[PDB]
């Protein structure tokens, strides 16, 4: 337990099958960095002592994570990146639950540390292939939805008239009919006295099929399957299956990885798409000195399984916070991601043909952010509009139609070689001339 | 439920409706 010469092994060669971790580490004053990195490597069975006590195990001889590198953090005075290798034999095949238990189960309480943040993980090809992963992934999703060459468009339903299931479905119909690909259960809407789940499912299925008959395009609504129990959760997933509807939704951090993986496997087995909402992520991922950075939680989700993932907004963020967001968006979507520190990517990640996950971006209040979103995300993203469609003065359907026109004109202009950073206002104003719905949204 | 008090419509309401329909 934290001997520093057992666990800090700076000449260790990293194996291909090892799981690597990068911990941003804040030692207690007077505790040297090599002792802290070794302690995180060791996960000592004494977390309040901060010293070796019972030493010599068969859990600590060949099944030991080793701290193979400690680097200073530039501009910081008491922070270090400690790199820990874990042998693949430590981990239960296909269990995100067990990988977090092994890596983050205990060390965040260790008294020798003042603060500890888990920045990144290298998931080796040998571990990646044990996971079922996302039920469909971005490509299959586009083929099943028949939707190519633009972002997908969503909006959250917040009805003006009631939270009843019937009014909920009316609003779903009005948004979808106007041009949106998806609408979205709010993450807390599971099954309440004001709106029981099975009533919600039935009225949403009528709305989806009505807007689909009307538009001739495939339509969905993310039906929240998050439940108190695995059996209630599967009761909801089964209902969606039987309605023949395209997509369901789960809050993977509050339901849990064990339930999320069960659900993702049900969705693979029955062809449902799985939208993933990231409620409580800021409890864990917000503070720079402590917790688990979202890119790790996104990587976990890609392994546990989800076809879409709430990935934040880039509205109101500086260029450096935007570099970070684009880093984890690449980890979500791509097959191979190279080490890139300025994007916060600490490890080369090879997904080994595991399907990518579609990021879901909060678009802003209005449609003038459309050029920036298309330029930053590219086409493989859902843009969610929280009140673009509904702050529109003519109502949900023209608001949906205004978002769709703006997305499509920005897409057209991007393909024509125009610079959306410079000319995006000129693209929108030019589409306002022929679209009365977009012209009324820009009057706002 | 409250008692529905009547609202005499404007004198040209029949006329207003007729012009609009055309």
């Amino acid at each position: 337990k934290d001997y520093r010469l057992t666990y800090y092994t700076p000449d260790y060669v990293v194996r291909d099958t090892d799981i690597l971790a990068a911990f941003r580490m804040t030692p207690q004053p007077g505790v040297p960095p090599e002792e802290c990195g070794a302690a995180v490597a060791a996960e000592s069975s004494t977390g309040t002592w901060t010293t070796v006590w019972t030493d010599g195990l068969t859990s600590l001889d060949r099944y030991k994570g080793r701290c193979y590198d400690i680097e200073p953090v530039p501009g910081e005075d008491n922070q270090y990146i400690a790199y820990v290798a874990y042998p693949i034999d430590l981990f239960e095949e296909g269990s995100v639950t067990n990988m977090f238990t092994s890596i983050v189960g205990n060390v965040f309480g260790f008294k020798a540390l003042r603060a500890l943040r888990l920045e990144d993980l290298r998931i080796p090809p040998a571990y990646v292939k044990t996971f079922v992963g996302p039920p469909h992934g971005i490509q299959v999703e586009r083929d099943k939805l028949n939707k190519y060459g633009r972002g997908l468009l969503g909006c959250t339903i917040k009805p003006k008239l009631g939270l009843s299931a019937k009014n909920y479905g009316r609003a779903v119909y009005e948004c979808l009919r106007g041009g949106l690909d998806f609408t979205k259960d709010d993450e807390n809407v599971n099954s309440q006295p004001f709106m029981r789940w099975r009533d919600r499912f039935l009225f949403v299925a009528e709305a989806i099929y009505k807007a689909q008959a009307e538009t001739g395009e495939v339509k969905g609504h993310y039906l929240n399957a998050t439940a108190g129990t695995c059996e209630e959760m599967m009761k909801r997933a089964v209902c969606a299956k039987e309605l023949g509807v395209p997509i369901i939704m789960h809050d993977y951090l509050t339901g849990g990885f064990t339930a999320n993986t069960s659900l993702a496997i049900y969705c693979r087995d029955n062809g449902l798409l799985l939208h993933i909402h990231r409620a409580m992520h800021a409890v864990i991922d917000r503070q720079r000195n402590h917790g688990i950075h979202f890119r790790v939680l996104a990587k976990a989700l890609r392994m546990s399984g989800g076809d879409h993932l709430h990935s934040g907004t880039v509205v109101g963020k500086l260029e450096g916070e935007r570099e970070v967001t684009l880093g984890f968006v690449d980890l979500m979507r791509d097959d191979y991601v190279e080490k890139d520190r300025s994007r916060g990517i600490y490890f080369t990640q090879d997904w080994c043909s595991m399907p990518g996950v579609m990021p879901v971006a909060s678009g802003g209040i209005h449609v003038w952010h459309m050029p920036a979103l298309v330029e930053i995300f590219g086409d493989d993203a859902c843009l969610q509009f929280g009140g673009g469609t509904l702050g529109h003065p003519w109502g949900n359907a023209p608001g949906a139609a205004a978002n769709r026109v703006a997305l499509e004109a920005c897409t057209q202009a991007r393909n024509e070689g125009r610079d959306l950073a410079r000319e995006g206002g000129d693209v929108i104003r030019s589409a306002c001339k022929w679209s009365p719905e977009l012209a009324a949204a820009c009057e706002v | 439920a409250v008692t529905p008090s009547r609202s005499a419509l404007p004198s040209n309401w029949k006329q207003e409706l007729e012009s609009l329909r055309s």
């Binding site: 309605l243 | 529905p4 008090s5």
Partner: protein, 138 residues
């Protein structure tokens, strides 16, 4: 002794067994909506979307119970929040029927206290609809 006809004799829920409500009859119903603090809204549908149907059930498993298509109609503009005068609804009825002459038009009302639709009755039948009978339905 007369026979209630089964042919072309479709009904559209509340008030469809009465003669079509005149403008004064619509205005008096709107007065009932306003006095209660309710929110009027108009909805419309084409004849093929106007009455209940089962066609989406082809996609289902054993879950069609109380599912029916065409309960939802299409909203005309927005719920008239703060409607106090009945002449706005009567104007909007004329505007909807002018834009959609082949459409049934229904007037609904929402009660924001109980957060639920609380009325719905028909204000306009299209002349070109043969689905319904002009109150010589016997």
């Amino acid at each position: 002794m007369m026979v209630w006809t089964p042919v072309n004799n479709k009904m559209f829920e509340t008030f469809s067994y009465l003669p079509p409500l005149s403008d004064e009859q619509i205005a008096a119903q709107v007065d009932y909506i306003v006095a209660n603090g309710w929110i009027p809204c108009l909805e419309f549908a084409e004849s093929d979307k106007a009455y209940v149907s089962n066609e989406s059930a082809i996609r289902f498993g054993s879950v069609s119970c109380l599912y029916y298509d065409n309960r939802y109609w299409t909203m005309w503009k927005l719920p008239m929040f703060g409607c106090r005068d009945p002449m706005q609804v009567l104007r909007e009825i004329v505007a909807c029927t002018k834009a959609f002459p082949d459409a049934y038009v229904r007037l609904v009302a929402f009660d924001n206290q109980k957060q639920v639709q609380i009325m719905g009755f028909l204000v306009q039948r299209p002349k070109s609809a043969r689905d319904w009978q002009p109150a010589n339905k016997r």
